[PDB]
Amino acid sequence: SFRPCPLSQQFCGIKERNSLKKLKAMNDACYEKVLESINEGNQIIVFVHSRKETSRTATWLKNKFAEENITHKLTKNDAGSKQILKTEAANVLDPSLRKLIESGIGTHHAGLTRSDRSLSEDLFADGLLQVLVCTATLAWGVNLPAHTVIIKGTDVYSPEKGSWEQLSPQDVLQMLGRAGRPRYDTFGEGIIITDQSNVQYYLSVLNQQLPIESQFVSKLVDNLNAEVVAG
RNA sequence: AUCCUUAUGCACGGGAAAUACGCAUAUCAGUGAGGAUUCGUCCGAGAUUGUGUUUUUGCUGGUUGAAAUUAUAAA
């Protein structure tokens, strides 16, 4: 309640089961959300699980909007804007992500060049990038908020277990944190695209119910050793 | 109040069939449709036309393949 921009929480709640349909459904939902947003002049972030996912998502987005309307994302006349784009498009953008950037729905992830990543970060800040597909780096690191924040999916793979776990509350909260800009905009759009069964669990997490539970059992021994060494 | 008959409506349940099942600004039709016949008579409700699907509508599930793919980060 004491937050600068109040966070409008939202869940999709996917009913589908099989992964080929489910994914499609999720994509559709995302598109719908994006459509709802961009018409209001809303700059938007789409979190995903993995690095490889992001680019594909971006590609999908590109193929969907061009059928209906290319114009709403590049609306400006672009005499100076175009020039700017030219300047900051084909410098060192290697990963075949340059096309995405050109389109105007780019991405930032661990596995994009330090220069490239920086550019991506600033291509929002300067005031041009509409949509931003993202891994969970941005939430952890960078302060840059972006009105609409969609979290695509539940199942992250952790090598800790060696299994597809649900999105952990501590990360989800962090992700949600970046939203409507405290300085400029009034409020924030927070969306979770998810499986319907795990929403019941997620709702509680969203209300900040699950506390700080200690994980000192793994890191105890080393600490103890260090202490001993210290004398 | 108890038991039954008929029709219907809603359903459990069990079957068969979809070569069937509709629809119509149509034409006609118990003031006769279409049929029987031992030829005396008898049954009595659709027919014509047009047309929409019709080896099938709607949904689910699996195996598969398809190639099915794993977050960040400090020392």
mmCIF file of C-alpha atoms (C1' of nucleotides) in Angstrom:
data_model
loop_
_atom_site.group_PDB
_atom_site.id
_atom_site.type_symbol
_atom_site.label_atom_id
_atom_site.label_comp_id
_atom_site.label_asym_id
_atom_site.label_seq_id
_atom_site.Cartn_x
_atom_site.Cartn_y
_atom_site.Cartn_z
ATOM 1 C CA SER A 1 0.000 0.000 0.000
ATOM 2 C CA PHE A 2 3.017 2.337 0.543
ATOM 3 C CA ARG A 3 4.376 1.555 -2.974
ATOM 4 C CA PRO A 4 4.866 4.468 -5.457
ATOM 5 C CA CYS A 5 3.070 2.752 -8.373
ATOM 6 C CA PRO A 6 0.426 0.286 -7.111
ATOM 7 C CA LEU A 7 0.815 -3.168 -8.677
ATOM 8 C CA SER A 8 -2.262 -4.443 -10.570
ATOM 9 C CA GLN A 9 -1.866 -8.223 -10.195
ATOM 10 C CA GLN A 10 -3.260 -10.497 -12.923
ATOM 11 C CA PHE A 11 -3.327 -14.233 -13.767
ATOM 12 C CA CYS A 12 -4.086 -15.923 -17.091
ATOM 13 C CA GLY A 13 -4.861 -19.458 -15.825
ATOM 14 C CA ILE A 14 -4.222 -21.924 -18.681
ATOM 15 C CA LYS A 15 -6.612 -24.931 -18.760
ATOM 16 C CA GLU A 16 -4.722 -26.939 -21.459
ATOM 17 C CA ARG A 17 -2.453 -29.906 -20.622
ATOM 18 C CA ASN A 18 -0.412 -31.094 -23.641
ATOM 19 C CA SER A 19 2.715 -28.975 -24.301
ATOM 20 C CA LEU A 20 2.193 -28.299 -28.047
ATOM 21 C CA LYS A 21 -1.281 -26.831 -27.543
ATOM 22 C CA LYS A 22 -0.495 -25.334 -24.142
ATOM 23 C CA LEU A 23 2.437 -23.323 -25.475
ATOM 24 C CA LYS A 24 0.313 -22.046 -28.357
ATOM 25 C CA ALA A 25 -2.414 -20.997 -25.928
ATOM 26 C CA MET A 26 0.135 -19.159 -23.794
ATOM 27 C CA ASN A 27 1.469 -17.362 -26.861
ATOM 28 C CA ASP A 28 -2.054 -16.339 -27.848
ATOM 29 C CA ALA A 29 -2.695 -15.014 -24.346
ATOM 30 C CA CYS A 30 0.532 -13.013 -24.467
ATOM 31 C CA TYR A 31 -0.449 -11.550 -27.832
ATOM 32 C CA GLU A 32 -3.853 -10.572 -26.465
ATOM 33 C CA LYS A 33 -2.233 -8.891 -23.467
ATOM 34 C CA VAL A 34 0.213 -7.056 -25.723
ATOM 35 C CA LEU A 35 -2.612 -5.932 -28.006
ATOM 36 C CA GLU A 36 -4.544 -4.605 -25.009
ATOM 37 C CA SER A 37 -1.468 -2.725 -23.811
ATOM 38 C CA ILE A 38 0.189 -1.142 -26.893
ATOM 39 C CA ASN A 39 -3.049 0.616 -27.951
ATOM 40 C CA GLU A 40 -2.816 2.640 -24.683
ATOM 41 C CA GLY A 41 0.860 3.583 -25.347
ATOM 42 C CA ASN A 42 2.230 0.977 -22.926
ATOM 43 C CA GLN A 43 5.902 -0.080 -22.941
ATOM 44 C CA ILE A 44 6.007 -3.768 -21.987
ATOM 45 C CA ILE A 45 8.280 -6.590 -20.671
ATOM 46 C CA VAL A 46 7.726 -10.348 -21.256
ATOM 47 C CA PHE A 47 9.725 -12.613 -18.905
ATOM 48 C CA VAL A 48 10.382 -16.243 -19.906
ATOM 49 C CA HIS A 49 12.181 -19.337 -18.534
ATOM 50 C CA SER A 50 15.192 -19.739 -20.799
ATOM 51 C CA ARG A 51 17.540 -17.864 -23.123
ATOM 52 C CA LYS A 52 16.713 -19.791 -26.305
ATOM 53 C CA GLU A 53 12.984 -19.253 -25.621
ATOM 54 C CA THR A 54 13.206 -15.469 -25.804
ATOM 55 C CA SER A 55 14.340 -15.136 -29.416
ATOM 56 C CA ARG A 56 11.708 -17.621 -30.572
ATOM 57 C CA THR A 57 9.023 -15.723 -28.657
ATOM 58 C CA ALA A 58 10.143 -12.480 -30.283
ATOM 59 C CA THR A 59 10.002 -14.110 -33.714
ATOM 60 C CA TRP A 60 6.489 -15.379 -33.005
ATOM 61 C CA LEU A 61 5.407 -11.900 -31.930
ATOM 62 C CA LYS A 62 6.856 -10.426 -35.119
ATOM 63 C CA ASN A 63 4.925 -12.922 -37.283
ATOM 64 C CA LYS A 64 1.619 -12.238 -35.441
ATOM 65 C CA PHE A 65 1.465 -8.397 -35.400
ATOM 66 C CA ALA A 66 2.568 -7.929 -39.054
ATOM 67 C CA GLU A 67 -0.580 -9.771 -40.243
ATOM 68 C CA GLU A 68 -2.964 -7.446 -38.366
ATOM 69 C CA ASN A 69 -1.083 -4.129 -37.941
ATOM 70 C CA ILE A 70 2.622 -3.263 -38.305
ATOM 71 C CA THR A 71 1.844 0.463 -37.798
ATOM 72 C CA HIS A 72 0.975 0.728 -34.055
ATOM 73 C CA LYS A 73 4.540 -0.174 -32.903
ATOM 74 C CA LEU A 74 6.409 2.068 -35.449
ATOM 75 C CA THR A 75 3.668 4.796 -35.468
ATOM 76 C CA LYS A 76 6.002 7.838 -35.658
ATOM 77 C CA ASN A 77 6.976 9.368 -39.042
ATOM 78 C CA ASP A 78 10.669 8.509 -38.434
ATOM 79 C CA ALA A 79 12.918 11.193 -39.943
ATOM 80 C CA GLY A 80 15.154 11.418 -36.859
ATOM 81 C CA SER A 81 13.808 8.238 -35.265
ATOM 82 C CA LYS A 82 14.755 6.243 -38.360
ATOM 83 C CA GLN A 83 18.252 7.729 -38.286
ATOM 84 C CA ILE A 84 18.591 6.831 -34.608
ATOM 85 C CA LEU A 85 17.498 3.264 -35.345
ATOM 86 C CA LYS A 86 20.047 3.022 -38.153
ATOM 87 C CA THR A 87 22.777 4.279 -35.830
ATOM 88 C CA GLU A 88 21.916 1.750 -33.083
ATOM 89 C CA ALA A 89 20.916 -1.363 -35.159
ATOM 90 C CA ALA A 90 23.762 -2.778 -37.293
ATOM 91 C CA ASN A 91 26.862 -1.894 -35.185
ATOM 92 C CA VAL A 92 27.747 -5.199 -33.379
ATOM 93 C CA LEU A 93 24.337 -6.947 -32.970
ATOM 94 C CA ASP A 94 25.486 -10.483 -33.846
ATOM 95 C CA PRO A 95 22.954 -13.160 -32.593
ATOM 96 C CA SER A 96 20.372 -12.704 -35.440
ATOM 97 C CA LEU A 97 18.462 -10.600 -32.862
ATOM 98 C CA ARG A 98 19.063 -7.438 -34.935
ATOM 99 C CA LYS A 99 15.959 -8.227 -36.990
ATOM 100 C CA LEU A 100 13.891 -8.260 -33.800
ATOM 101 C CA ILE A 101 15.357 -4.906 -32.776
ATOM 102 C CA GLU A 102 14.543 -3.467 -36.199
ATOM 103 C CA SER A 103 10.968 -4.725 -35.913
ATOM 104 C CA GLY A 104 10.669 -3.049 -32.480
ATOM 105 C CA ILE A 105 10.004 -5.942 -30.040
ATOM 106 C CA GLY A 106 13.539 -6.889 -28.960
ATOM 107 C CA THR A 107 15.175 -8.860 -26.167
ATOM 108 C CA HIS A 108 17.839 -8.903 -23.436
ATOM 109 C CA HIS A 109 19.329 -12.071 -21.916
ATOM 110 C CA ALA A 110 22.496 -13.652 -20.525
ATOM 111 C CA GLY A 111 24.030 -14.642 -23.862
ATOM 112 C CA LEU A 112 23.639 -11.229 -25.518
ATOM 113 C CA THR A 113 26.868 -9.180 -25.901
ATOM 114 C CA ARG A 114 27.806 -6.710 -23.138
ATOM 115 C CA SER A 115 27.652 -3.870 -25.664
ATOM 116 C CA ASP A 116 24.516 -5.295 -27.269
ATOM 117 C CA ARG A 117 22.853 -5.799 -23.892
ATOM 118 C CA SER A 118 23.725 -2.230 -22.892
ATOM 119 C CA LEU A 119 22.217 -0.946 -26.137
ATOM 120 C CA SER A 120 19.053 -2.945 -25.495
ATOM 121 C CA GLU A 121 18.823 -1.507 -21.985
ATOM 122 C CA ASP A 122 19.197 2.063 -23.358
ATOM 123 C CA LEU A 123 16.875 1.471 -26.391
ATOM 124 C CA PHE A 124 14.109 1.414 -23.755
ATOM 125 C CA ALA A 125 15.541 4.308 -21.676
ATOM 126 C CA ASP A 126 16.080 6.697 -24.649
ATOM 127 C CA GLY A 127 12.373 6.089 -25.462
ATOM 128 C CA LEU A 128 11.840 3.782 -28.456
ATOM 129 C CA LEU A 129 11.528 0.029 -27.637
ATOM 130 C CA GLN A 130 7.861 -1.023 -27.240
ATOM 131 C CA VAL A 131 8.055 -4.736 -26.315
ATOM 132 C CA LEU A 132 10.950 -6.361 -24.464
ATOM 133 C CA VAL A 133 11.244 -10.174 -24.252
ATOM 134 C CA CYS A 134 13.438 -11.085 -21.269
ATOM 135 C CA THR A 135 15.040 -13.761 -19.151
ATOM 136 C CA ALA A 136 15.194 -13.280 -15.343
ATOM 137 C CA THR A 137 18.437 -11.195 -15.396
ATOM 138 C CA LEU A 138 16.767 -7.804 -15.695
ATOM 139 C CA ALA A 139 14.631 -8.196 -12.584
ATOM 140 C CA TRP A 140 17.632 -9.164 -10.480
ATOM 141 C CA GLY A 141 19.979 -6.496 -11.810
ATOM 142 C CA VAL A 142 18.681 -3.378 -13.458
ATOM 143 C CA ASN A 143 16.290 -0.781 -11.975
ATOM 144 C CA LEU A 144 14.624 0.160 -15.338
ATOM 145 C CA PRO A 145 10.847 -0.295 -14.864
ATOM 146 C CA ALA A 146 8.410 -0.877 -17.754
ATOM 147 C CA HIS A 147 4.658 -0.332 -17.142
ATOM 148 C CA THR A 148 3.412 -3.788 -18.276
ATOM 149 C CA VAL A 149 5.223 -6.920 -16.984
ATOM 150 C CA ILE A 150 4.123 -10.385 -18.166
ATOM 151 C CA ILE A 151 5.695 -13.551 -16.670
ATOM 152 C CA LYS A 152 5.438 -16.397 -19.200
ATOM 153 C CA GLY A 153 5.317 -19.831 -17.584
ATOM 154 C CA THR A 154 5.771 -21.677 -14.294
ATOM 155 C CA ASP A 155 8.290 -24.472 -14.932
ATOM 156 C CA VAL A 156 11.910 -23.326 -14.537
ATOM 157 C CA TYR A 157 14.696 -25.926 -14.684
ATOM 158 C CA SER A 158 17.096 -25.798 -11.717
ATOM 159 C CA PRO A 159 20.323 -27.896 -11.836
ATOM 160 C CA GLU A 160 20.041 -27.844 -7.989
ATOM 161 C CA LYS A 161 17.395 -30.580 -8.281
ATOM 162 C CA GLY A 162 17.765 -31.622 -11.920
ATOM 163 C CA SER A 163 14.025 -31.141 -12.464
ATOM 164 C CA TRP A 164 11.428 -28.598 -13.670
ATOM 165 C CA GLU A 165 10.341 -26.707 -10.515
ATOM 166 C CA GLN A 166 7.683 -23.979 -10.234
ATOM 167 C CA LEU A 167 8.750 -20.318 -10.239
ATOM 168 C CA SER A 168 10.135 -19.631 -6.752
ATOM 169 C CA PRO A 169 8.283 -16.814 -4.824
ATOM 170 C CA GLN A 170 11.455 -14.747 -4.164
ATOM 171 C CA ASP A 171 12.140 -14.417 -7.923
ATOM 172 C CA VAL A 172 8.516 -13.834 -8.911
ATOM 173 C CA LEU A 173 8.198 -10.965 -6.439
ATOM 174 C CA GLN A 174 11.401 -9.409 -7.766
ATOM 175 C CA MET A 175 10.100 -9.688 -11.327
ATOM 176 C CA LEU A 176 6.835 -8.030 -10.305
ATOM 177 C CA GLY A 177 8.754 -5.206 -8.638
ATOM 178 C CA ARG A 178 9.707 -3.715 -12.006
ATOM 179 C CA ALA A 179 6.413 -2.373 -13.393
ATOM 180 C CA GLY A 180 4.884 1.161 -13.707
ATOM 181 C CA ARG A 181 7.625 3.773 -13.429
ATOM 182 C CA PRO A 182 7.586 5.483 -9.960
ATOM 183 C CA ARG A 183 8.927 8.700 -11.546
ATOM 184 C CA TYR A 184 6.675 9.041 -14.634
ATOM 185 C CA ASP A 185 3.623 6.723 -14.786
ATOM 186 C CA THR A 186 0.775 6.313 -12.259
ATOM 187 C CA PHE A 187 0.427 2.510 -11.762
ATOM 188 C CA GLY A 188 1.709 -0.932 -12.882
ATOM 189 C CA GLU A 189 0.329 -3.868 -14.919
ATOM 190 C CA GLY A 190 1.560 -7.196 -13.453
ATOM 191 C CA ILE A 191 0.594 -10.393 -15.326
ATOM 192 C CA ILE A 192 1.442 -14.071 -14.750
ATOM 193 C CA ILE A 193 0.840 -16.429 -17.694
ATOM 194 C CA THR A 194 0.593 -19.823 -15.930
ATOM 195 C CA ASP A 195 -1.028 -23.274 -15.572
ATOM 196 C CA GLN A 196 -4.428 -23.010 -13.788
ATOM 197 C CA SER A 197 -3.659 -25.695 -11.163
ATOM 198 C CA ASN A 198 -0.653 -23.833 -9.736
ATOM 199 C CA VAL A 199 -2.420 -20.415 -9.660
ATOM 200 C CA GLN A 200 -3.978 -21.318 -6.251
ATOM 201 C CA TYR A 201 -0.411 -21.687 -4.965
ATOM 202 C CA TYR A 202 0.796 -18.545 -6.793
ATOM 203 C CA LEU A 203 -1.957 -16.318 -5.414
ATOM 204 C CA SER A 204 -0.749 -16.836 -1.852
ATOM 205 C CA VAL A 205 2.829 -16.094 -2.898
ATOM 206 C CA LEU A 206 1.698 -12.904 -4.624
ATOM 207 C CA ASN A 207 0.048 -11.760 -1.334
ATOM 208 C CA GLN A 208 3.566 -12.034 0.284
ATOM 209 C CA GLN A 209 2.589 -14.949 2.541
ATOM 210 C CA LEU A 210 5.566 -17.351 2.254
ATOM 211 C CA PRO A 211 8.258 -15.941 4.608
ATOM 212 C CA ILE A 212 12.074 -15.898 4.549
ATOM 213 C CA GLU A 213 12.860 -19.568 5.338
ATOM 214 C CA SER A 214 16.535 -20.349 6.018
ATOM 215 C CA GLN A 215 18.738 -22.397 3.668
ATOM 216 C CA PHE A 216 21.794 -22.514 5.976
ATOM 217 C CA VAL A 217 21.886 -26.367 6.031
ATOM 218 C CA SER A 218 23.946 -26.550 2.792
ATOM 219 C CA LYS A 219 26.282 -23.577 3.499
ATOM 220 C CA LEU A 220 26.814 -24.360 7.238
ATOM 221 C CA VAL A 221 29.877 -26.583 6.938
ATOM 222 C CA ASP A 222 32.026 -24.254 4.841
ATOM 223 C CA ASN A 223 31.175 -21.337 7.128
ATOM 224 C CA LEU A 224 32.112 -23.409 10.172
ATOM 225 C CA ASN A 225 35.426 -24.338 8.559
ATOM 226 C CA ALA A 226 36.127 -20.681 7.802
ATOM 227 C CA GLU A 227 35.369 -19.748 11.406
ATOM 228 C CA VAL A 228 37.722 -22.463 12.645
ATOM 229 C CA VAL A 229 40.459 -21.189 10.336
ATOM 230 C CA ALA A 230 39.951 -17.654 11.637
ATOM 231 C CA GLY A 231 40.659 -19.150 15.088
ATOM 232 C "C1'" A B 1 -54.299 -41.516 -0.204
ATOM 233 C "C1'" U B 2 -52.891 -46.507 -3.194
ATOM 234 C "C1'" C B 3 -52.642 -48.945 -8.466
ATOM 235 C "C1'" C B 4 -52.907 -48.616 -13.617
ATOM 236 C "C1'" U B 5 -53.725 -46.352 -19.204
ATOM 237 C "C1'" U B 6 -52.471 -43.033 -22.757
ATOM 238 C "C1'" A B 7 -49.583 -38.768 -24.533
ATOM 239 C "C1'" U B 8 -45.972 -35.819 -23.713
ATOM 240 C "C1'" G B 9 -41.727 -33.384 -21.250
ATOM 241 C "C1'" C B 10 -37.028 -34.418 -18.285
ATOM 242 C "C1'" A B 11 -33.748 -37.812 -17.298
ATOM 243 C "C1'" C B 12 -31.049 -42.826 -15.409
ATOM 244 C "C1'" G B 13 -30.141 -47.234 -17.909
ATOM 245 C "C1'" G B 14 -29.838 -50.711 -22.435
ATOM 246 C "C1'" G B 15 -29.703 -51.086 -27.463
ATOM 247 C "C1'" A B 16 -29.786 -50.165 -33.199
ATOM 248 C "C1'" A B 17 -28.854 -46.404 -37.162
ATOM 249 C "C1'" A B 18 -26.423 -42.495 -39.364
ATOM 250 C "C1'" U B 19 -27.657 -44.671 -47.141
ATOM 251 C "C1'" A B 20 -29.493 -41.189 -42.601
ATOM 252 C "C1'" C B 21 -31.031 -36.923 -40.725
ATOM 253 C "C1'" G B 22 -32.688 -32.071 -41.483
ATOM 254 C "C1'" C B 23 -34.089 -27.154 -43.521
ATOM 255 C "C1'" A B 24 -37.448 -24.379 -46.943
ATOM 256 C "C1'" U B 25 -41.107 -16.669 -48.084
ATOM 257 C "C1'" A B 26 -41.718 -23.248 -52.383
ATOM 258 C "C1'" U B 27 -46.220 -26.516 -54.989
ATOM 259 C "C1'" C B 28 -50.025 -29.715 -53.198
ATOM 260 C "C1'" A B 29 -52.283 -32.354 -49.449
ATOM 261 C "C1'" G B 30 -58.076 -36.047 -43.976
ATOM 262 C "C1'" U B 31 -62.886 -30.436 -48.822
ATOM 263 C "C1'" G B 32 -57.833 -37.089 -49.468
ATOM 264 C "C1'" A B 33 -51.342 -37.502 -49.660
ATOM 265 C "C1'" G B 34 -49.568 -42.131 -50.886
ATOM 266 C "C1'" G B 35 -50.845 -46.875 -51.119
ATOM 267 C "C1'" A B 36 -53.165 -51.873 -50.684
ATOM 268 C "C1'" U B 37 -57.498 -55.799 -53.584
ATOM 269 C "C1'" U B 38 -59.337 -62.120 -52.908
ATOM 270 C "C1'" C B 39 -62.110 -56.592 -57.311
ATOM 271 C "C1'" G B 40 -66.751 -56.817 -53.462
ATOM 272 C "C1'" U B 41 -63.345 -53.573 -51.332
ATOM 273 C "C1'" C B 42 -59.444 -52.052 -47.778
ATOM 274 C "C1'" C B 43 -55.725 -49.018 -45.334
ATOM 275 C "C1'" G B 44 -55.424 -43.771 -44.366
ATOM 276 C "C1'" A B 45 -50.791 -39.597 -44.050
ATOM 277 C "C1'" G B 46 -47.504 -37.530 -46.396
ATOM 278 C "C1'" A B 47 -46.196 -36.407 -51.358
ATOM 279 C "C1'" U B 48 -43.825 -33.281 -54.937
ATOM 280 C "C1'" U B 49 -39.922 -29.774 -55.729
ATOM 281 C "C1'" G B 50 -35.492 -27.384 -54.121
ATOM 282 C "C1'" U B 51 -31.729 -28.063 -51.236
ATOM 283 C "C1'" G B 52 -27.566 -28.735 -46.569
ATOM 284 C "C1'" U B 53 -24.533 -32.033 -44.623
ATOM 285 C "C1'" U B 54 -24.281 -37.194 -45.221
ATOM 286 C "C1'" U B 55 -17.067 -43.269 -45.564
ATOM 287 C "C1'" U B 56 -19.870 -38.454 -40.675
ATOM 288 C "C1'" U B 57 -20.722 -32.603 -35.994
ATOM 289 C "C1'" G B 58 -18.439 -31.206 -31.252
ATOM 290 C "C1'" C B 59 -14.978 -32.223 -27.875
ATOM 291 C "C1'" U B 60 -10.893 -34.972 -24.991
ATOM 292 C "C1'" G B 61 -6.530 -38.409 -24.233
ATOM 293 C "C1'" G B 62 -2.121 -41.038 -25.466
ATOM 294 C "C1'" U B 63 2.074 -42.560 -28.142
ATOM 295 C "C1'" U B 64 4.917 -40.542 -30.940
ATOM 296 C "C1'" G B 65 7.509 -38.217 -34.201
ATOM 297 C "C1'" A B 66 8.458 -32.916 -35.315
ATOM 298 C "C1'" A B 67 14.258 -32.856 -33.405
ATOM 299 C "C1'" A B 68 11.246 -32.664 -29.078
ATOM 300 C "C1'" U B 69 15.375 -27.512 -25.980
ATOM 301 C "C1'" U B 70 17.040 -26.208 -19.421
ATOM 302 C "C1'" A B 71 16.720 -19.874 -15.223
ATOM 303 C "C1'" U B 72 21.246 -15.822 -12.329
ATOM 304 C "C1'" A B 73 25.497 -15.143 -10.352
ATOM 305 C "C1'" A B 74 29.344 -13.477 -6.263
ATOM 306 C "C1'" A B 75 33.942 -14.925 -4.872
#
